[PDB]
Amino acid sequence: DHMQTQEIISVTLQVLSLLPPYRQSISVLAGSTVEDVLKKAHELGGFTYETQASLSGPYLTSVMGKAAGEREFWQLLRDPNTPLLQGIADYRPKDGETIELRLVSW
Ligand code: B12
Ligand SMILES: C#Cc1ccc(F)cc1F
Numbered sequence: 672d673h674m675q676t677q678e679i680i681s682v683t684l685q686v687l688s689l690l691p692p693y694r695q696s697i698s699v700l701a702g703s704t705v706e707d708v709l710k711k712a713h714e715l716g717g718f719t720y721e722t723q724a725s726l727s728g729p730y731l732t733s734v735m736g737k738a739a740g741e742r743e744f745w746q747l748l749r750d751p752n753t754p755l756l757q758g759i760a761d762y763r764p765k766d767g768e769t770i771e772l773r774l775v776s777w
């Protein structure tokens with residue numbers, strides 16, 4: 672009886688680089704980008720983030736109040752432990768995906 676035609680999908684968003692960690696299932700419209708997931712998570716309450724505009728599209732600079740500093744970046748991953756090959760405005764997760772934001776240093 673539930674919708675199985677995927678007009679609405681659900682994507683788990685997780686951030687484990689912070690204490691306390693964040694993990695929530697976020698429902699969004701089909702075809703949503705990662706950025707749409709971040710927007711929804713913020714709208715629902717209990718999540719925040721910031722981006723910076725660029726010629727390559729929005730770049731994720733801060734997650735849950737923690738801004739990336741020198742030689743750090745917020746990395747985007749899908750299951751299993753696989754970094755995305757597109758940014759937040761271009762990657763469109765599949766229904767049931769888990770997107771992780773991970774603070775990585777080089
Ligand atoms: C080095 C690099 C990075 C470095 C940049 C550090 C630095 N240089 O100071 C770091 C590690 C931070 C990085 C991160 C990411 N990046 Co990168 N990166 C590169 C790379 C290999 C070279 C860029 C460069 O030095 N260009 C030369 C300088 C002179 O030109 P520039 O225009 O000023 O370059 C800047 C931008 O490229 C920006 N940048 C780098 N990556 C990304 C990704 C996105 C989405 C944006 C908006 C900007 C951006 O940082 C550069 C320095 O300021 C390119 C491949 C390429 N195109 O060259 C990718 C590339 C741009 N990155 C890419 C990706 C996917 C990512 C990540 C999403 C990976 C991830 N899974 O987390 C993240 C960004 C997530 C976020 N927080 O928004 C993709 C983008 C494809 C797309 N547009 O959808 C590219 C094209 C590689 C690829 N083909 O897979 N990246
Ligand atoms: C960005 C970026 C990036 C990170 C790791 C890698 F093996 C290739 C890349 F373009």
Ligand SMILES: [Ca+2]
Nearest residue numbers: 672673674675
């Ligand atoms: Ca059903």
